[PDB]
Amino acid sequence: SGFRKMAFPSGKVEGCMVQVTCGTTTLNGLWLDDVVYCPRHVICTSEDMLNPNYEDLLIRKSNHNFLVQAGNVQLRVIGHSMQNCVLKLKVDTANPKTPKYKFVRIQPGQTFSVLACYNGSPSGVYQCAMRPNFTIKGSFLNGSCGSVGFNIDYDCVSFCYMHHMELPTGVHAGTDLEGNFYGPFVDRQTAQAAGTDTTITVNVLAWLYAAVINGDRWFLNRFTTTLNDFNLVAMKYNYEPLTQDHVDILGPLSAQTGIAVLDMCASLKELLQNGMNGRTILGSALLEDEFTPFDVVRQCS
Amino acid sequence: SGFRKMAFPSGKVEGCMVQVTCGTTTLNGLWLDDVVYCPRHVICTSEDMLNPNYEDLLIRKSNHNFLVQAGNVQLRVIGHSMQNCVLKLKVDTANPKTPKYKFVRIQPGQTFSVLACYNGSPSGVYQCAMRPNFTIKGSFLNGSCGSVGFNIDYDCVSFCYMHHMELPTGVHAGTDLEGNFYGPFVDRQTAQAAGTDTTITVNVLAWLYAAVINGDRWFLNRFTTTLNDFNLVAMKYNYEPLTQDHVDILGPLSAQTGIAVLDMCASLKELLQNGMNGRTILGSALLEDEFTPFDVVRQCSGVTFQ
Ligand SMILES: O=C1CCC(=O)N1c1cc(Cl)cc(Cl)c1
Ligand SMILES: [Cl-]
Ligand SMILES: [Cl-]
Numbered sequence: 001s002g003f004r005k006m007a008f009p010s011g012k013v014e015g016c017m018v019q020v021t022c023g024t025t026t027l028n029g030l031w032l033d034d035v036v037y038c039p040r041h042v043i044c045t046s047e048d049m050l051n052p053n054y055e056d057l058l059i060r061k062s063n064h065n066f067l068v069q070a071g072n073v074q075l076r077v078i079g080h081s082m083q084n085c086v087l088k089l090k091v092d093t094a095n096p097k098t099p100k101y102k103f104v105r106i107q108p109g110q111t112f113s114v115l116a117c118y119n120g121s122p123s124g125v126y127q128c129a130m131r132p133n134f135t136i137k138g139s140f141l142n143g144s145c146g147s148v149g150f151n152i153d154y155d156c157v158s159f160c161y162m163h164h165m166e167l168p169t170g171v172h173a174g175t176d177l178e179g180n181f182y183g184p185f186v187d188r189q190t191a192q193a194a195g196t197d198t199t200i201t202v203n204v205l206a207w208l209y210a211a212v213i214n215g216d217r218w219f220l221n222r223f224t225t226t227l228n229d230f231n232l233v234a235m236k237y238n239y240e241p242l243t244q245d246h247v248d249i250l251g252p253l254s255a256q257t258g259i260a261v262l263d264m265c266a267s268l269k270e271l272l273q274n275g276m277n278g279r280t281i282l283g284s285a286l287l288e289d290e291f292t293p294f295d296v297v298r299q300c301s
Numbered sequence: 302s303g304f305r306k307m308a309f310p311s312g313k314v315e316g317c318m319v320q321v322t323c324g325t326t327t328l329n330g331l332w333l334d335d336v337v338y339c340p341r342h343v344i345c346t347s348e349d350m351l352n353p354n355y356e357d358l359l360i361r362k363s364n365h366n367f368l369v370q371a372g373n374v375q376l377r378v379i380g381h382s383m384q385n386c387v388l389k390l391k392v393d394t395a396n397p398k399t400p401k402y403k404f405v406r407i408q409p410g411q412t413f414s415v416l417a418c419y420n421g422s423p424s425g426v427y428q429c430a431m432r433p434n435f436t437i438k439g440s441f442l443n444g445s446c447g448s449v450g451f452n453i454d455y456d457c458v459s460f461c462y463m464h465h466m467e468l469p470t471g472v473h474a475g476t477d478l479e480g481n482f483y484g485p486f487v488d489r490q491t492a493q494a495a496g497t498d499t500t501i502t503v504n505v506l507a508w509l510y511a512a513v514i515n516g517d518r519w520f521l522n523r524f525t526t527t528l529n530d531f532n533l534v535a536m537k538y539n540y541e542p543l544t545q546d547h548v549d550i551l552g553p554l555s556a557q558t559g560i561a562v563l564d565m566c567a568s569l570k571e572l573l574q575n576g577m578n579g580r581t582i583l584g585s586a587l588l589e590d591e592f593t594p595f596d597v598v599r600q601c602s603g604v605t606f607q
């Protein structure tokens with residue numbers, strides 16, 4: 001028993017992290033087979049930050065302008081290309097530590113682990129979720145660009161995020177590993193602001209099911225709700241709408257606990273109305289929304 | 302910016318995890334140099350576990366009664382012995398992935414990363430504090446015994462915890478890597494309870510400093526206090542005593558933020574006596590006590606472990 005925000009073990013990703021230097025800029029790269037992936041903004045100068053023309057900046061570069069260091073070893077760059085907002089540096093060594101892997105673009109509400117890195121060396125691992133407004137609430141300092149987010153299925157690493165920038169509210173924006181940003185953001189220093197963020201309803205419900213599995217029932221009630229009445233209430237608290245997809249997704253946890261999905265929705269409605277009245281749920285005094293239904297089943301079994 | 306509960310990168314420890322089977326029991330072992338460490342209770346049947354005589358149970362065992370698999374390779378056990386509550390299985394092959402390491406025993410209030418494992422295979426990593434009542438609020442299912450806890454310092458892994466059991470309240474008990482339990486627990490299937498827990502005061506203060514570093518300042522106030530006055534408040538609220546060493550340890554953060562420790566103590570006094578009044582700190586409505594002063598400095602400075 002117990003319930004913790006738990007990340008995937010990071011070793012398979014650690015063995016892929018390298019340092020990429022261009023000019024006076026150093027950040028992190030992800031080395032898989034013979035390619036190093038990193039944010040294309042590594043080629044920006046201090047003049048290039050508002051309206052960089054990346055095509056024009058890249059055509060001016062030679063392979064030897066990119067310094068790639070893996071541990072204490074310099075890799076040889078033998079080719080380069082840009083794919084959306086990521087740079088792909090072809091190197092003359094396949095990484096012998098390359099795991100089984102895939103690139104996956106995720107949807108808001110999905111969770112993943114982040115291996116924060118600086119100078120090609122991993123610092124820490126934590127769990128994050130893609131917010132409804134396509135940001136993540138990360139922990140990243142200068143130099144962390146190119147750190148990645150991932151899940152592990154069996155022994156297969158699914159890379160879903162590459163870190164590019166911090167927005168003015170202190171939240172973080174980035175791309176998938178094909179270089180497409182999550183959300184409406186661009187790799188320019190022009191003013192950009194995240195949308196107002198909302199709570200990931202389906203994840204809160206998942207986490208309430210986790211609480212019941214771990215033996216806590218105090219927040220349940222004798223009521224139920226229609227799906228539409230639930231959404232009408234929950235949106236008044238800045239909760240994302242709950243769709244029938246989400247209701248279906250919660251089927252397994254509902255079956256395991258014996259609490260119907262819309263019955264749990266009624267519990268959530270009451271919690272939003274009442275607060276916790278000095279109680280806690282799984283050690284929290286707030287409703288937690290960065291555990292998915294899949295996470296809950298994986299951790300509680 | 303941002304502040305997250307953060308574990309050490311777990312790769313160096315992943316390369317050490319193996320599967321240990323004895324009879325019908327499978328759990329995890331730690332393979333370092335040519336020795337595999339795991340809980341001595343692996344040798345018990347359920348009858349045994351009621352009142353085990355471990356020396357007696359072990360005499361019966363041959364090396365070949367211990368099936369150790371590293372990945373999909375079997376390890377040959379060539380000797381076996383106990384140290385306190387850990388079994389040490391001498392194997393015929395040194396682990397080629399052994400990291401630089403030490404065995405250290407931590408103190409209550411100190412944090413560490415747990416690599417949760419099942420059948421020798423790492424499944425998850427998370428950060429824990431050794432509670433004042435010597436339990437940890439972990440997340441472990443059947444099969445997790447032998448999972449370990451650790452810190453990293455430079456390139457050296459300091460192993461500090463091996464998981465042994467779950468208590469009736471759902472918190473967790475285990476040993477250091479020399480097999481000495483944290484807390485007043487025994488490796489026997491009985492009646493045991495965690496003592497009443499308290500809050501780790503120095504860590505709450507550390508986390509308040511983290512909040513300030515991250516722009517969350519509403520709880521700051523113009524007041525300061527004394528150790529003795531604050532410690533009376535702490536005792537009243539089931540908070541650990543704050544000592545002068547704690548104050549010294551927080552010195553760096555006091556210098557960096559402009560908030561003396563006793564100035565922050567007055568913030569904490571007011572939070573305890575009045576609550577948060579609908580507000581949050583670093584996204585929490587509870588006062589978080591599982592970040593040490595060192596953790597806050599490390600995360601708000603970007604220290605790495607290549
Ligand atoms: O087996 C153990 C070791 C730790 C501990 O407290 N137990 C335990 C727990 C419950 Cl709930 C019931 C019983 Cl008989 C024993
Ligand atoms: Cl997804
Ligand atoms: Cl909370």
Ligand code: NA
Pocket residue numbers: 521522523524525563564565567568
């Ligand atoms: Na003050």
